Amino acid sequence: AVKIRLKRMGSKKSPFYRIVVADSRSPRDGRFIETVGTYNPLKDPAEVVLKEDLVLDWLSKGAQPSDTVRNILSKEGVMKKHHEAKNVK
Amino acid sequence: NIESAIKRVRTSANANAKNSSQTNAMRTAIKKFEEAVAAGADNVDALYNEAVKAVDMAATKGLIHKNKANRDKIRLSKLAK
Amino acid sequence: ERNQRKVYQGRVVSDKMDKTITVVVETKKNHPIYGKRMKYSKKYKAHDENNTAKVGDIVKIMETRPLSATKRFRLLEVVEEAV
RNA sequence: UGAGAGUUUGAUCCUGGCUCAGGACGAACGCUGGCGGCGUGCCUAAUACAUGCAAGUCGAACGCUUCUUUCCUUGGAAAGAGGAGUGGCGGACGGGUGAGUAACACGUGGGUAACCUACCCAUCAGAGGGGGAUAACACUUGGAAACAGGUGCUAAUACCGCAUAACAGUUUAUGCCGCAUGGCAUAAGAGUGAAAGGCGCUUUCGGGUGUCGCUGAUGGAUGGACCCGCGGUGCAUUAGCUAGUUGGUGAGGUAACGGCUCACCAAGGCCACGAUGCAUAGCCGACCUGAGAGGGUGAUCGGCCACACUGGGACUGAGACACGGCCCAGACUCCUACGGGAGGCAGCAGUAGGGAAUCUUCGGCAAUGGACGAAAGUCUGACCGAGCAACGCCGCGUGAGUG
RNA sequence: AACCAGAAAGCCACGGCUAACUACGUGCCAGCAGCCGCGGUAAUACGUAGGUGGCAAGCGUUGUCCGGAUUUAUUGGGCGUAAAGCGAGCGCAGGCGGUUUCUUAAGUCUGAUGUGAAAGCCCCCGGCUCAACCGGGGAGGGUCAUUGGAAACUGGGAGAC
């Protein structure tokens, strides 16, 4: 059940999120595989940097992103290019 | 304490009963084959085919998982001829 | 094939057992605190194929797979024969 | 990037011990006591625990039953809500503690022509047709209780048999290749399943069809297992230890090689480069200190390993020899009609005790992450925040001009 | 945006080592002290008072670890008289070895590949009004494994003096 999701690094009141693929058995900030991109919640509009090249060949291997990951990957056409590459091809 | 896992105990007891029955059926099949070949009387092929089909059903219906079934078909084929 | 085993080169102590010899490898290591070239040895246990090995003779060996109760190597070639 | 002083003598110079100036603390005690931000808080008895909460969920698998409603009002459809039970999935994750352990337990580099893998993606092939039960239910039996039976009826994606499926495994032959045993490709010789299911749809007899499920094989992915070189601790006023030990043959067994276990044969194996024994300790990322080589330590936080009152055992399951699962023995606590039963805070708060000494029996799923479910949702002492403590670190105050 | 200098400072030392001295009382009693050593009537060493000196919402005491400690000395000590060459000899094992030619390449050096999880230390930048803190971007740490080179030294093999 490989799965990409969030992981936070903030202090007490102001979080800061990194997107990182972890196995689902692991804890919230436990071990993982590799960090791919991060997520700043604060300072709206939301500020996201992604490597976005491992992600295509790392979803084609098959992993299920969570819901906040789904919104912030829909905001860059990630799933767009995913089904444009898989179904459409 | 016991909370809601008492549902699993009944399931495991029923699985014990029927798994014991089916595996003892397989063991008496193979035992009958061995006692048949060791005397070497007539009617040697039918109980051989029965033992093969019994190992197959024990692999498929219940569980061994795959591999003791393969090893038993090998060591039972070498015992046949 | 990606990589062979780590083959070792040594010599023989005993050969009394059937298909089985006793191989010594030996090299140098520095001391942790000080620095001279002290040397030491390890004894391994290979497996001869037809008991044709020699008492005290140069040979080389290869990692194989766990074949018996703590012996693991196999004979490859007598590198140098001694009288 | 390296700062020396006192102290033996009536006075001197050497060699030499002892004390002082530096910094750190999960620290405590004394005196004194404003606030704000960020962290930290049983090291001692792995001592005994009252109380409250810490894992459940799916009606779109299956019947049953209760209540509230316009439904032909004596009955009625449908809807809403409640309850118990068969069935699937998760309770092996997430949290806690270092008691054991001097070893492939850890760290690092390797290996599998000795290996397995539920959930998630990819591909090919199927999804034919039968059969018998049973919980609930209704009635009764024995019991202080814990609950155990009996008779009769009922359903399924529960169960069982028939058929069909080599694409799996074996052997033969051909070719290609390899680290002996061997691996790969092709053509032939013997035996295996299904939910046949659900939600809906265009849908005229019709029965074609979408989605979520079911079954066989092969790959990707994550996760688990085994084997090897190297390195990390004192004692010689601890020098011999070992019979399934060492090797072979065959058989059994394991996912998987193997004395893993048996039967037979031969007596081998390890040690002064420290075997064996004895004592102490979980191991690393790291932390303090130092010019550096080093020396000391392993609390937070990240990884691995081990343990769940003590000691044995297996079953279900893809996955435990199982942290709020079962059985047995033992110590301890409780109930009893004496016949017999119930139990395990090293989960969160708290209690009692030990101590020089370490917190509130708090609020909430809004965020992130799990589990179930098509979705809404339900659970979540994980977590998010609040409260206590000059414990550490940081910042700003207890006016100021003239006088 | 209004009111208020108003409610807001204690702790240790003062003989040398080590910045800071004077009165009164005690009288080798009482007491003090890290070490030296101070008190039998005149004590900067005891008790108080004044002043001073060092810190500051902290100051002191206790306990532990590292430095100073070249006091385990590889860097970095020695052995005539101060601790310290066995009473002397023969020898297994072990350590260290004359000169040269050729060869190997284990040690030694060097290049490339993979690896040293994340957070910590360090360097640059960004954000809380700075700081503490947080975030982004880099290097470090093996006696590490594979592969390609070098041949002065050491080792291994062949000769020669």
mmCIF file with all atom_site columns, N, CA, C and O (backbone and C1' of nucleotides) in Angstrom, chain D residues 140-149:
data_model
loop_
_atom_site.group_PDB
_atom_site.id
_atom_site.type_symbol
_atom_site.label_atom_id
_atom_site.label_alt_id
_atom_site.label_comp_id
_atom_site.label_asym_id
_atom_site.label_entity_id
_atom_site.label_seq_id
_atom_site.pdbx_PDB_ins_code
_atom_site.Cartn_x
_atom_site.Cartn_y
_atom_site.Cartn_z
_atom_site.occupancy
_atom_site.B_iso_or_equiv
_atom_site.pdbx_formal_charge
_atom_site.auth_seq_id
_atom_site.auth_comp_id
_atom_site.auth_asym_id
_atom_site.auth_atom_id
_atom_site.pdbx_PDB_model_num
ATOM 1  P P     . U D 1 140 ? -42.194 -23.230 26.877 1.00 0.00 ? 140 U D P     1
ATOM 2  O "O5'" . U D 1 140 ? -41.961 -24.796 27.034 1.00 0.00 ? 140 U D "O5'" 1
ATOM 3  C "C5'" . U D 1 140 ? -41.262 -25.299 28.155 1.00 0.00 ? 140 U D "C5'" 1
ATOM 4  C "C4'" . U D 1 140 ? -40.223 -26.319 27.772 1.00 0.00 ? 140 U D "C4'" 1
ATOM 5  C "C3'" . U D 1 140 ? -39.066 -26.436 28.739 1.00 0.00 ? 140 U D "C3'" 1
ATOM 6  O "O3'" . U D 1 140 ? -39.387 -27.200 29.880 1.00 0.00 ? 140 U D "O3'" 1
ATOM 7  C "C1'" . U D 1 140 ? -38.234 -26.373 26.531 1.00 0.00 ? 140 U D "C1'" 1
ATOM 8  P P     . U D 1 141 ? -38.788 -26.769 31.300 1.00 0.00 ? 141 U D P     1
ATOM 9  O "O5'" . U D 1 141 ? -37.392 -27.530 31.350 1.00 0.00 ? 141 U D "O5'" 1
ATOM 10 C "C5'" . U D 1 141 ? -37.314 -28.904 31.008 1.00 0.00 ? 141 U D "C5'" 1
ATOM 11 C "C4'" . U D 1 141 ? -35.890 -29.394 31.004 1.00 0.00 ? 141 U D "C4'" 1
ATOM 12 C "C3'" . U D 1 141 ? -34.999 -28.840 32.098 1.00 0.00 ? 141 U D "C3'" 1
ATOM 13 O "O3'" . U D 1 141 ? -35.195 -29.483 33.341 1.00 0.00 ? 141 U D "O3'" 1
ATOM 14 C "C1'" . U D 1 141 ? -33.851 -28.785 30.033 1.00 0.00 ? 141 U D "C1'" 1
ATOM 15 P P     . G D 1 142 ? -35.015 -28.655 34.703 1.00 0.00 ? 142 G D P     1
ATOM 16 O "O5'" . G D 1 142 ? -33.437 -28.540 34.871 1.00 0.00 ? 142 G D "O5'" 1
ATOM 17 C "C5'" . G D 1 142 ? -32.624 -29.698 34.993 1.00 0.00 ? 142 G D "C5'" 1
ATOM 18 C "C4'" . G D 1 142 ? -31.175 -29.319 35.128 1.00 0.00 ? 142 G D "C4'" 1
ATOM 19 C "C3'" . G D 1 142 ? -30.921 -28.117 36.013 1.00 0.00 ? 142 G D "C3'" 1
ATOM 20 O "O3'" . G D 1 142 ? -30.884 -28.467 37.377 1.00 0.00 ? 142 G D "O3'" 1
ATOM 21 C "C1'" . G D 1 142 ? -29.715 -27.882 34.000 1.00 0.00 ? 142 G D "C1'" 1
ATOM 22 P P     . G D 1 143 ? -30.919 -27.319 38.485 1.00 0.00 ? 143 G D P     1
ATOM 23 O "O5'" . G D 1 143 ? -29.390 -26.939 38.678 1.00 0.00 ? 143 G D "O5'" 1
ATOM 24 C "C5'" . G D 1 143 ? -29.038 -25.792 39.419 1.00 0.00 ? 143 G D "C5'" 1
ATOM 25 C "C4'" . G D 1 143 ? -27.939 -25.006 38.757 1.00 0.00 ? 143 G D "C4'" 1
ATOM 26 C "C3'" . G D 1 143 ? -27.956 -23.522 39.044 1.00 0.00 ? 143 G D "C3'" 1
ATOM 27 O "O3'" . G D 1 143 ? -27.407 -23.226 40.312 1.00 0.00 ? 143 G D "O3'" 1
ATOM 28 C "C1'" . G D 1 143 ? -27.552 -23.895 36.738 1.00 0.00 ? 143 G D "C1'" 1
ATOM 29 P P     . A D 1 144 ? -28.348 -22.674 41.485 1.00 0.00 ? 144 A D P     1
ATOM 30 O "O5'" . A D 1 144 ? -28.417 -21.119 41.182 1.00 0.00 ? 144 A D "O5'" 1
ATOM 31 C "C5'" . A D 1 144 ? -29.227 -20.264 41.963 1.00 0.00 ? 144 A D "C5'" 1
ATOM 32 C "C4'" . A D 1 144 ? -28.557 -18.937 42.164 1.00 0.00 ? 144 A D "C4'" 1
ATOM 33 C "C3'" . A D 1 144 ? -27.811 -18.392 40.961 1.00 0.00 ? 144 A D "C3'" 1
ATOM 34 O "O3'" . A D 1 144 ? -28.644 -17.799 39.980 1.00 0.00 ? 144 A D "O3'" 1
ATOM 35 C "C1'" . A D 1 144 ? -26.422 -18.247 42.836 1.00 0.00 ? 144 A D "C1'" 1
ATOM 36 P P     . A D 1 145 ? -28.464 -18.195 38.429 1.00 0.00 ? 145 A D P     1
ATOM 37 O "O5'" . A D 1 145 ? -27.184 -17.371 37.957 1.00 0.00 ? 145 A D "O5'" 1
ATOM 38 C "C5'" . A D 1 145 ? -27.092 -15.965 38.150 1.00 0.00 ? 145 A D "C5'" 1
ATOM 39 C "C4'" . A D 1 145 ? -25.653 -15.514 38.222 1.00 0.00 ? 145 A D "C4'" 1
ATOM 40 C "C3'" . A D 1 145 ? -24.813 -15.780 36.980 1.00 0.00 ? 145 A D "C3'" 1
ATOM 41 O "O3'" . A D 1 145 ? -24.905 -14.724 36.043 1.00 0.00 ? 145 A D "O3'" 1
ATOM 42 C "C1'" . A D 1 145 ? -23.695 -16.621 38.877 1.00 0.00 ? 145 A D "C1'" 1
ATOM 43 P P     . A D 1 146 ? -24.787 -15.017 34.473 1.00 0.00 ? 146 A D P     1
ATOM 44 O "O5'" . A D 1 146 ? -23.288 -15.504 34.277 1.00 0.00 ? 146 A D "O5'" 1
ATOM 45 C "C5'" . A D 1 146 ? -22.208 -14.587 34.257 1.00 0.00 ? 146 A D "C5'" 1
ATOM 46 C "C4'" . A D 1 146 ? -20.932 -15.313 33.941 1.00 0.00 ? 146 A D "C4'" 1
ATOM 47 C "C3'" . A D 1 146 ? -20.952 -16.089 32.633 1.00 0.00 ? 146 A D "C3'" 1
ATOM 48 O "O3'" . A D 1 146 ? -20.543 -15.297 31.537 1.00 0.00 ? 146 A D "O3'" 1
ATOM 49 C "C1'" . A D 1 146 ? -20.235 -17.507 34.384 1.00 0.00 ? 146 A D "C1'" 1
ATOM 50 P P     . C D 1 147 ? -21.615 -14.747 30.480 1.00 0.00 ? 147 C D P     1
ATOM 51 O "O5'" . C D 1 147 ? -22.610 -15.966 30.261 1.00 0.00 ? 147 C D "O5'" 1
ATOM 52 C "C5'" . C D 1 147 ? -22.355 -16.935 29.259 1.00 0.00 ? 147 C D "C5'" 1
ATOM 53 C "C4'" . C D 1 147 ? -22.221 -18.307 29.855 1.00 0.00 ? 147 C D "C4'" 1
ATOM 54 C "C3'" . C D 1 147 ? -22.331 -19.461 28.879 1.00 0.00 ? 147 C D "C3'" 1
ATOM 55 O "O3'" . C D 1 147 ? -21.108 -19.717 28.215 1.00 0.00 ? 147 C D "O3'" 1
ATOM 56 C "C1'" . C D 1 147 ? -23.659 -19.889 30.798 1.00 0.00 ? 147 C D "C1'" 1
ATOM 57 P P     . A D 1 148 ? -21.095 -20.510 26.823 1.00 0.00 ? 148 A D P     1
ATOM 58 O "O5'" . A D 1 148 ? -21.174 -22.035 27.256 1.00 0.00 ? 148 A D "O5'" 1
ATOM 59 C "C5'" . A D 1 148 ? -22.015 -22.942 26.567 1.00 0.00 ? 148 A D "C5'" 1
ATOM 60 C "C4'" . A D 1 148 ? -22.308 -24.159 27.400 1.00 0.00 ? 148 A D "C4'" 1
ATOM 61 C "C3'" . A D 1 148 ? -23.171 -25.209 26.729 1.00 0.00 ? 148 A D "C3'" 1
ATOM 62 O "O3'" . A D 1 148 ? -22.432 -26.064 25.885 1.00 0.00 ? 148 A D "O3'" 1
ATOM 63 C "C1'" . A D 1 148 ? -24.048 -24.751 28.855 1.00 0.00 ? 148 A D "C1'" 1
ATOM 64 P P     . G D 1 149 ? -22.906 -26.269 24.369 1.00 0.00 ? 149 G D P     1
ATOM 65 O "O5'" . G D 1 149 ? -24.494 -26.248 24.480 1.00 0.00 ? 149 G D "O5'" 1
ATOM 66 C "C5'" . G D 1 149 ? -25.295 -27.132 23.711 1.00 0.00 ? 149 G D "C5'" 1
ATOM 67 C "C4'" . G D 1 149 ? -25.851 -28.245 24.559 1.00 0.00 ? 149 G D "C4'" 1
ATOM 68 C "C3'" . G D 1 149 ? -27.018 -29.008 23.962 1.00 0.00 ? 149 G D "C3'" 1
ATOM 69 O "O3'" . G D 1 149 ? -26.627 -29.991 23.025 1.00 0.00 ? 149 G D "O3'" 1
ATOM 70 C "C1'" . G D 1 149 ? -27.551 -28.404 26.166 1.00 0.00 ? 149 G D "C1'" 1
#
